[PDB]
């Protein structure tokens with residue numbers, strides 16, 4: 577399709593996020609899922625080229641982050657809920673995400689599906705939007721609630737059960753892929769593997785004598801859209817403030833050097849992943865936008881005649897109208 581398609585859906589995402597909605601609308605979008613520590617934040621920060629996501633122990637993000645990367649001549653960030661303000665200090669971007677997590681979930685330490693919408697304008701990005709969802713976990717730690725696993729999983733299921741949700745299933749290579757939370761979720765909701773894109777992180781950490789060639793050649797657990805491997809900064813690199821440019825150069829050198837991957841190298845790494853996701857997401861929106869408009873229309877007229885809480889219903893009514901107006 578067209579280069580207008582990702583920005584179109586950004587505006588849809590803003591319209592529905594303004595009333596605290598996203599998952600129920602079945603928007604064509606990429607949801608990023610993984611186990612905690614799979615490397616999701618790292619992928620997103622690689623795309624942006626700056627650190628901007630909360631780090632530290634436990635479940636630091638507890639809402640969806642609708643991350644909208646917009647190629648632009650200038651570089652800055654805007655939050656939908658902070659109208660007017662342009663962030664150029666990505667450390668303040670991170671503090672604002674932390675503040676939004678605390679404001680909605682800080683008492684319960686639970687999970688909320690209410691999205692945070694963050695747009696990052698930059699000359700260094702392709703148009704690409706991803707809905708980052710909290711990483712899955714198994715054992716509550718510290719002050720986490722006893723059902724934290726299910727709070728997280730139930731919330732991400734609200735997104736990925738939707739047929740227009742592409743799933744960016746992030747799994748670390750230094751684990752048996754058969755243990756992947758991301759790919760388990762994806763196979764539950766997408767059993768034929770038609771709307772799941774595999775990202776394999778941490779290839780630099782695999783055990784000697786092993787490699788992920790079978791996974792990356794799409795042979796171990798085939799997905800129609802395949803798998804892309806990436807090599808992000810280690811924790812030591814993060815703490816040493818290694819720059820992303822140097823990380824990307826190390827990742828390219830890794831794929832060109834590794835005997836098990838060098839024949840795949842041009843379909844590996846973070847720049848390729850960004851390009852592939854921009855292309856598949858654009859094509860995905862093209863294929864699904866007409867169906868979305870019908871879904872939204874039907875939802876709208878359902879609301880109108882039921883109108884014949886209702887406060888939430890009227891908010892949805894105006895958001896749906898706004899969305900249909902954006903689709904035009």
Ligand SMILES: Nc1nc2c(ncn2[C@@H]2O[C@H](COP(=O)(O)OP(=O)(O)O)[C@@H](O)[C@H]2O)c(=O)[nH]1
Pocket residue numbers: 610611612613614615616617618619711777778779780781806807808809810811812814
């Ligand atoms: N060596 C290496 N470490 C990684 C890679 N990706 C992430 N990490 C480290 O894994 C940890 C978790 O990554 P992060 O992106 O925060 O995981 P998230 O919880 O899924 O967002 C951090 O200590 C990262 O520095 C990678 O490809 N290689």
